[PDB]
Amino acid sequence: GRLRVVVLGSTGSIGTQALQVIADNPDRFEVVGLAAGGAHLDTLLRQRAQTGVTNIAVADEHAAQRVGDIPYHGSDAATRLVEQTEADVVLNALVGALGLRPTLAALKTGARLALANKESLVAGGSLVLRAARPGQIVPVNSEHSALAQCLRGGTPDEVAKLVLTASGGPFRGWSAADLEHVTPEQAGAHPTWSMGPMNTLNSASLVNKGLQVIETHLLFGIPYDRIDVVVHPQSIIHSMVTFIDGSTIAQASPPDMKLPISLALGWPRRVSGAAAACDFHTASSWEFEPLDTDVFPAVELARQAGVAGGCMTAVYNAANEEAAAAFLAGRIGFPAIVGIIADVLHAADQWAVEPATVDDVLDAQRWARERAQRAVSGM
């Protein structure tokens, strides 16, 4: 009853939290593989030494050289590790487009895919879906973990609406006027979670929410007009399902990713002590407010891309990555991230064709990146 776990992106936030869950629960889990990029070698060496796992992939060839003895090195190291390691669960916590091929490799093996890497579902679309058995993909993000728990509240035909919650970002309440003046560091701190410069920016622009709506449709098969977003500044309620009789079932916990991680690794079984529970011996308040879809149209823009289907969500994602890098570099303003997403989706006519192979997906992203660059060039 012990699950063999491959951890991809082991040195990041999710990767390290997942290793602590596995360390705490040797009854339930064992690490059998680690993959990293090569940029934090001290962490990875520390992880090799602490877990005793030598079955390691490192993307950067130079960093893998620097370390020596690494059995998998290069841009396909993570994919090859997954292909050649027997495991029950593959945790994909890699960042960006490079999570796609290791996602596809993992699905092919039969292992449960515990998915933090959103880009692989968002961009992979039906390519990833065709490769997956029912229930094989288990979401790691707290919103989707919340949804999966809440769906147990009824049969599938009893689902009326999925309700995703959003923190609302640092600029909740701000008008369009004052969104123009946002600096790369004003969008650099998140109220409840501590994440990377990209992932914290995606919370500020509401594109992380947009992307999660896409993932929600792809994970659970609920239509886009039945997936709602509500602003909940506290991030204690992580999501809800409303049923056909009027009942809403909600999931709540203090923000700690170890909870959704442990549940994604152990699914369907809950992992005793994974995280602290809500304390009802002290006063608290859960506030909800409607999202401002005029100032923050990134979610509706994600529905539009999602309804168009095929490779259009790959376009929505890839356009974001490029426009976001331009923001962090200092080349474009804050509102220009979503404005450029809009302009790129409007030109992306051809990319509504369903992908047959990874290259179709790769072809759409290439186009979107270029088109996104051309839009940046114009300002």
What are the residues binding a copy of itself (CB under 8 A)?
149-150, 152-155, 158, 160-161, 163, 228, 230, 237, 240, 242-254, 256, 259, 262-263, 269-278, 280-290
> Among 54, 12, 14, which Cα is nearest to 36's?
12
Q: Which stretch binds ligand NDP (CB under 6 A): 37-45, 151-159, 281-289, 354-362?
A: 37-45
Stretch 248-287: interaction string toward ligand NDP, x if CB under 6 A: ---------x------------------------------
Cβ of residue 115: shortest distance to a copy of itself, in angstroms? Answer: 19
Q: Closer CB to ligand NDP, residue 144 or residue 303? A: 144
Q: Does residue 141 touch ligand NDP according to CB under 6 A?
A: yes
Question: What does 149 bind: ligand NDP, a copy of itself, none (CB cut-off 5 to 8 Å by kind)?
Answer: a copy of itself
Cβ of residue 238: shortest distance to a copy of itself, in angstroms? Answer: 9
Q: Does residue 196 touch ligand NDP according to CB under 6 A?
A: yes
Cβ of residue 261: shortest distance to a copy of itself, in angstroms? Answer: 10
Distance CA 331, CA 377 (A): 9
Distance CA 114, CA 216 (A): 15
Question: What does 39 bind: ligand NDP, a copy of itself, none (CB cut-off 5 to 8 Å by kind)?
Answer: ligand NDP
The span from the first CA to the last CA of the chain, in angstroms, equals 57
Question: What does 233 bind: ligand NDP, a copy of itself, none (CB cut-off 5 to 8 Å by kind)?
Answer: none
Question: What does 34 bind: ligand NDP, a copy of itself, none (CB cut-off 5 to 8 Å by kind)?
Answer: none
Q: Which stretch binds ligand NDP (CB under 6 A): 88-96, 160-168, 184-192, 232-240?
A: 88-96
Side chain identity, residue 81? L
> Among 140, 169, 316, which Cα is nearest to 229's?
169
H/E/C letters for each residue in 167-222?
A: CCCCCCCCCHHHHCCCCCCCCCCCCCCCCCHHHHHHHHCCHHHHHHHHHHHHHHCC
Site for ligand NDP in 221-250 (CB under 6 A): none
Residue 15: DSSP 8-state: H
**Number of residues in contact with ligand NDP under rule CB under 6 A:** 29
φ and ψ at 92, to 5 degrees?
-95, 100
Side chain identity, residue 245? D
Cβ of residue 21: shortest distance to a copy of itself, in angstroms? Answer: 10
Helix H or strand E segment including 89: strand 89-92
Q: Map tokens 């969008």 to a residue.
A: 187
Q: Does residue 195 touch ligand NDP according to CB under 6 A?
A: yes
> Among 322, 364, 321, 367, which Cα is nearest to 95's?
321
Q: Does residue 40 touch ligand NDP according to CB under 6 A?
A: yes
Q: Does residue 118 touch ligand NDP according to CB under 6 A?
A: yes
Query: Looking at beta carbons, which pairs linking 289-293 to residues 24 or more positions away fall under 8 Å?
Result: 289/168, 289/230, 289/231, 289/232, 289/233, 290/230, 290/231, 291/166, 291/168, 291/206, 291/229, 291/230, 291/231, 292/173
Residue 97: DSSP 8-state: G
Examine residue 268 and say whether the peptide bond preceding it is cis (omega within 30 degrees of 0): yes
Question: What does 215 bind: a copy of itself, ligand NDP, none (CB cut-off 5 to 8 Å by kind)?
Answer: none
Q: Which of 3, 6, 7, 15 binds ligand NDP (CB under 6 A)?
A: 15
Q: Which of 3, 116, 166, 302 binds ligand NDP (CB under 6 A)?
A: 116
Q: Does residue 20 touch ligand NDP according to CB under 6 A?
A: no
Q: Which of 3, 5, 34, 98 binds ligand NDP (CB under 6 A)?
A: 98
Angle of the 207-220 helix axis to the 197-204 helix axis, nearest 10 = 90
Question: What does 150 bind: a copy of itself, ligand NDP, none (CB cut-off 5 to 8 Å by kind)?
Answer: a copy of itself
**Site residues, ligand NDP (CB under 6 A):** 9-15, 35-40, 59, 78, 93-95, 98, 116-119, 141, 193, 195-196, 199, 257
